[PDB]
PDB file of C-alpha atoms (C1' of nucleotides) in Angstrom:
ATOM      1  CA  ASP X   1     -27.202-107.905 178.467  1.00 28.85           C
ATOM      2  CA  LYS X   2     -27.345-107.788 174.609  1.00 29.60           C
ATOM      3  CA  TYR X   3     -26.882-104.360 172.914  1.00 32.28           C
ATOM      4  CA  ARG X   4     -27.226-105.637 169.347  1.00 31.39           C
ATOM      5  CA  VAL X   5     -28.042-109.060 167.839  1.00 30.21           C
ATOM      6  CA  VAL X   6     -26.262-110.084 164.598  1.00 29.38           C
ATOM      7  CA  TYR X   7     -28.654-111.064 161.849  1.00 28.99           C
ATOM      8  CA  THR X   8     -28.091-114.335 160.007  1.00 25.66           C
ATOM      9  CA  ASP X   9     -26.823-114.282 156.422  1.00 25.63           C
ATOM     10  CA  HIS X  10     -30.273-115.703 155.426  1.00 23.13           C
ATOM     11  CA  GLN X  11     -32.130-112.955 157.204  1.00 20.65           C
ATOM     12  CA  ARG X  12     -29.961-110.310 155.603  1.00 19.48           C
ATOM     13  CA  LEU X  13     -30.410-111.835 152.143  1.00 19.68           C
ATOM     14  CA  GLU X  14     -34.189-111.733 152.213  1.00 20.80           C
ATOM     15  CA  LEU X  15     -34.116-108.178 153.491  1.00 23.06           C
ATOM     16  CA  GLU X  16     -31.762-107.023 150.717  1.00 22.18           C
ATOM     17  CA  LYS X  17     -33.960-108.744 148.137  1.00 20.86           C
ATOM     18  CA  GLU X  18     -37.099-107.157 149.447  1.00 19.22           C
ATOM     19  CA  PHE X  19     -35.274-103.822 149.597  1.00 18.86           C
ATOM     20  CA  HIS X  20     -34.515-104.173 145.887  1.00 19.16           C
ATOM     21  CA  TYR X  21     -38.186-104.984 145.305  1.00 14.79           C
ATOM     22  CA  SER X  22     -39.093-101.650 147.031  1.00 17.75           C
ATOM     23  CA  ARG X  23     -37.234 -99.126 149.144  1.00 17.53           C
ATOM     24  CA  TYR X  24     -40.243 -98.668 151.513  1.00 17.82           C
ATOM     25  CA  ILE X  25     -41.917-101.667 152.901  1.00 17.98           C
ATOM     26  CA  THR X  26     -45.687-101.950 153.225  1.00 17.81           C
ATOM     27  CA  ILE X  27     -47.462-102.636 156.426  1.00 17.37           C
ATOM     28  CA  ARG X  28     -48.757-105.984 155.128  1.00 17.64           C
ATOM     29  CA  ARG X  29     -45.426-107.127 153.648  1.00 19.00           C
ATOM     30  CA  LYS X  30     -43.589-106.033 156.788  1.00 22.00           C
ATOM     31  CA  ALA X  31     -45.836-108.284 158.782  1.00 24.81           C
ATOM     32  CA  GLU X  32     -45.297-111.275 156.346  1.00 27.36           C
ATOM     33  CA  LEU X  33     -41.535-110.862 156.256  1.00 26.14           C
ATOM     34  CA  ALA X  34     -41.213-110.505 160.030  1.00 25.94           C
ATOM     35  CA  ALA X  35     -43.229-113.652 160.576  1.00 24.73           C
ATOM     36  CA  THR X  36     -41.319-115.701 157.991  1.00 27.32           C
ATOM     37  CA  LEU X  37     -37.910-114.400 159.121  1.00 26.58           C
ATOM     38  CA  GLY X  38     -38.196-114.612 162.879  1.00 26.98           C
ATOM     39  CA  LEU X  39     -37.712-110.926 163.639  1.00 23.30           C
ATOM     40  CA  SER X  40     -40.018-108.319 164.914  1.00 22.67           C
ATOM     41  CA  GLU X  41     -41.948-105.764 162.920  1.00 23.64           C
ATOM     42  CA  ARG X  42     -40.013-103.101 164.744  1.00 21.58           C
ATOM     43  CA  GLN X  43     -36.691-104.636 163.777  1.00 21.28           C
ATOM     44  CA  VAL X  44     -37.792-104.800 160.192  1.00 24.22           C
ATOM     45  CA  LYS X  45     -38.926-101.179 160.299  1.00 25.69           C
ATOM     46  CA  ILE X  46     -35.667-100.094 161.710  1.00 28.91           C
ATOM     47  CA  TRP X  47     -33.574-102.144 159.324  1.00 33.30           C
ATOM     48  CA  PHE X  48     -35.379-100.522 156.434  1.00 37.28           C
ATOM     49  CA  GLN X  49     -34.746 -97.133 157.872  1.00 39.49           C
ATOM     50  CA  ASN X  50     -31.007 -97.881 158.213  1.00 38.10           C
ATOM     51  CA  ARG X  51     -30.778 -99.293 154.682  1.00 36.48           C
ATOM     52  CA  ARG X  52     -32.273 -96.087 153.210  1.00 37.28           C
ATOM     53  CA  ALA X  53     -29.625 -94.101 155.121  1.00 36.88           C
ATOM     54  CA  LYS X  54     -26.911 -96.303 153.798  1.00 38.63           C
ATOM     55  CA  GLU X  55     -28.334 -95.777 150.329  1.00 40.76           C
ATOM     56  CA  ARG X  56     -28.380 -91.999 150.708  1.00 37.01           C
ATOM     57  CA  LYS X  57     -24.806 -92.138 151.916  1.00 36.83           C
ATOM     58  CA  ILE X  58     -23.674 -94.338 148.944  1.00 34.62           C
ATOM     59  CA  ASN X  59     -25.563 -92.095 146.499  1.00 34.19           C
ATOM     60  CA  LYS X  60     -23.893 -88.866 147.703  1.00 37.63           C
ATOM     61  CA  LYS X  61     -20.557 -90.609 147.153  1.00 37.87           C
ATOM     62  CA  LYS X  62     -21.526 -91.876 143.705  1.00 40.18           C
ATOM     63  CA  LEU X  63     -22.308 -88.222 142.951  1.00 41.00           C
ATOM     64  CA  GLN X  64     -19.038 -86.926 144.446  1.00 41.31           C
ATOM     65  CA  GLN X  65     -17.129 -89.385 142.252  1.00 43.76           C
ATOM     66  CA  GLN X  66     -19.053 -88.359 139.141  1.00 43.24           C
ATOM     67  CA  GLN X  67     -18.423 -84.661 139.751  1.00 38.68           C
ATOM     68  CA  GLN X  68     -14.682 -85.686 139.731  1.00 35.67           C
ATOM     69  CA  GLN X  69     -14.083 -86.341 135.913  1.00 29.68           C
ATOM     70  CA  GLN X  70     -13.877 -84.312 132.557  1.00 31.04           C
TER      71      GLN X  70
ATOM     72  C1'  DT H   1      -2.057-107.150 170.449  1.00 27.89           C
ATOM     73  C1'  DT H   2      -3.707-102.595 169.928  1.00 29.34           C
ATOM     74  C1'  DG H   3      -4.985 -99.179 167.602  1.00 30.05           C
ATOM     75  C1'  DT H   4      -8.116 -97.290 163.841  1.00 28.30           C
ATOM     76  C1'  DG H   5     -11.706 -97.464 160.517  1.00 30.44           C
ATOM     77  C1'  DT H   6     -15.959 -99.038 158.744  1.00 30.78           C
ATOM     78  C1'  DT H   7     -20.290-101.684 159.220  1.00 31.06           C
ATOM     79  C1'  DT H   8     -24.263-103.220 161.564  1.00 33.55           C
ATOM     80  C1'  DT H   9     -28.212-103.051 165.210  1.00 34.10           C
ATOM     81  C1'  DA H  10     -30.813 -99.914 167.880  1.00 35.22           C
ATOM     82  C1'  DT H  11     -32.320 -95.908 170.085  1.00 34.72           C
ATOM     83  C1'  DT H  12     -33.593 -90.882 170.544  1.00 35.08           C
ATOM     84  C1'  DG H  13     -35.991 -86.991 169.356  1.00 34.43           C
ATOM     85  C1'  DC H  14     -38.162 -84.071 166.207  1.00 33.32           C
ATOM     86  C1'  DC H  15     -41.327 -83.451 161.834  1.00 33.63           C
ATOM     87  C1'  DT H  16     -45.109 -84.274 158.931  1.00 33.43           C
ATOM     88  C1'  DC H  17     -49.039 -85.918 157.529  1.00 32.09           C
ATOM     89  C1'  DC H  18     -56.096 -84.280 157.563  1.00 33.69           C
TER      90       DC H  18
ATOM     91  C1'  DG O   1     -56.684 -90.442 165.894  1.00 35.32           C
ATOM     92  C1'  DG O   2     -50.314 -92.135 166.112  1.00 34.57           C
ATOM     93  C1'  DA O   3     -48.051 -94.050 161.944  1.00 35.23           C
ATOM     94  C1'  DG O   4     -44.186 -93.406 159.428  1.00 32.60           C
ATOM     95  C1'  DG O   5     -40.141 -90.587 157.836  1.00 31.84           C
ATOM     96  C1'  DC O   6     -35.219 -88.746 158.733  1.00 25.19           C
ATOM     97  C1'  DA O   7     -30.731 -87.285 161.306  1.00 23.22           C
ATOM     98  C1'  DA O   8     -27.604 -87.859 164.620  1.00 19.06           C
ATOM     99  C1'  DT O   9     -25.770 -90.702 167.670  1.00 20.79           C
ATOM    100  C1'  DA O  10     -24.076 -95.070 170.590  1.00 21.03           C
ATOM    101  C1'  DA O  11     -21.700 -99.516 170.913  1.00 18.86           C
ATOM    102  C1'  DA O  12     -20.912-104.210 169.379  1.00 16.77           C
ATOM    103  C1'  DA O  13     -18.740-106.411 165.548  1.00 17.77           C
ATOM    104  C1'  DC O  14     -15.766-106.873 162.128  1.00 20.17           C
ATOM    105  C1'  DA O  15     -11.443-106.135 159.381  1.00 18.21           C
ATOM    106  C1'  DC O  16      -6.823-105.424 159.230  1.00 18.86           C
ATOM    107  C1'  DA O  17      -2.273-102.685 159.831  1.00 18.31           C
ATOM    108  C1'  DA O  18       1.141-101.747 162.086  1.00 14.34           C
TER     109       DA O  18
END
DNA sequence: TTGTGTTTTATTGCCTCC
DNA sequence: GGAGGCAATAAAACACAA
């Protein structure tokens, strides 16, 4: 049935932290993180892709706001 | 509630690396 | 010799007003 799982607040936290460590995850790290977090490598891949899109989207907006002063 | 918007998983399909 | 990137999209989930 399921169309999307919801990730636990723990799982998200680790992933955000790691994302701050580096925007692109290494093959080795990916494998560590998946194993310690109880998700698949694919899910971690994908999550990292989404987070970079979110970041691009937030950055464009930061820019749009900064164009809007003086 | 219901409608209305934004966020979060997950896929698809195309591109680029020698 | 196939991984890894992005964009565009879908739908569940949330948030919350009216």
